[PDB]
Design a protein around this ligand. Sequence first.
Ligand SMILES: N[C@@H](CCC(=O)O)C(=O)O
Length: 416
Amino acid sequence: IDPFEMAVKQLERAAQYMDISEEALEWLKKPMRIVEVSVPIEMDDGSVKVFTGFRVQHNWARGPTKGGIRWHPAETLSTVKALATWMTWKVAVVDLPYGGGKGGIIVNPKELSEREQERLARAYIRAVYDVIGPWTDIPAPDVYTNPKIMGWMMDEYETIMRRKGPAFGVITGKPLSIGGSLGRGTATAQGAIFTIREAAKALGIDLKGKKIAVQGYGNAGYYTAKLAKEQLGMTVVAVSDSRGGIYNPDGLDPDEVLKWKREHGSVKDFPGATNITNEELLELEVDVLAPAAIEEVITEKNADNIKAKIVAEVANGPVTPEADDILREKGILQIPDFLCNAGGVTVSYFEWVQNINGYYWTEEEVREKLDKKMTKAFWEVYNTHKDKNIHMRDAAYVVAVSRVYQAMKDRGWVKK
Ligand SMILES: N[C@@H](CCC(=O)O)C(=O)O
């Protein structure tokens, strides 16, 4: 099934639970500007190859649009549009002065050399310069793009811009040497930890000494486990990568597990732990569960088997709506996916603020501001959850769409 249709259906289901005019819904069902450009680069053999680049700006009622750039061979305009629509609600739920945006290039970056990658980044900037800017559209790292590409892109934008303004703020996720921000490596995990702490506070659970299980041991999963163990004082009992999983009731040390992963290539056969698979790992009796891996892991097949009191969807939509209803029926508190992992876009917003102001913060200041933003967003969503007696995901959609609708009404875009 197409992704943009999925996003529009999600938006309509959200609008079912809130009072929104028909014209506003029709406005929100369409991206406000879609730009498709040709991105020509000259390769190492001397030939010129043309790639397809996208830049979708779904809505900018609340402010300049925000969103990353994907370099995937399976990129489509539908995927970019759906992700921009998703980014609108993501920045709206955590109360940022941002709209929704998304870019992408249909390219296999594995077959490109470093020089070709730099040429691709610079050519993409030259192609989409007319629709981006510090106050118009702020790109960011995404799938198969990294801070190196972000720095190349910022340099090209500054060259075109003739240094007439804050060219550092045109793009986020930059290296620290050029307008980069601290806390940019643990943003998602720190936001997830703050949301988990707030959820435990709401449920009355003290996390000191409790159990956590994490699926997926990449950046997000590893940092989530590490920050949970240190800040929340919890007992990490199960971690897993795409290969396999391990279990130890007394507690695992995430640093040692990461070292083992680096050495042997996987978390398999970790000393002192029992090797398990992802599916049973999802069903251990643990206080909180943090799926930080491939989407759609909790379905109707295993939804009733979840024994976790809190499920923090660190990954992008790892739970299906049927599993959502089943989990809610069990009383299991769910943190919606675009609320749990909203720390990354919040820290990107902080980086943009630092670049715009010309003044840069420390790690402690970024951490405290992230704490404030995530706590306030979670409490807003939870209060909507209780007041409307609807699902947590539905409450997050209600909050985001209500904010965007209010901004649209204030500008006079929609009269009703
Ligand atoms: N959420 C996307 C892009 C949003 C942003 O960081 O600005 C990402 O994973 O990078």
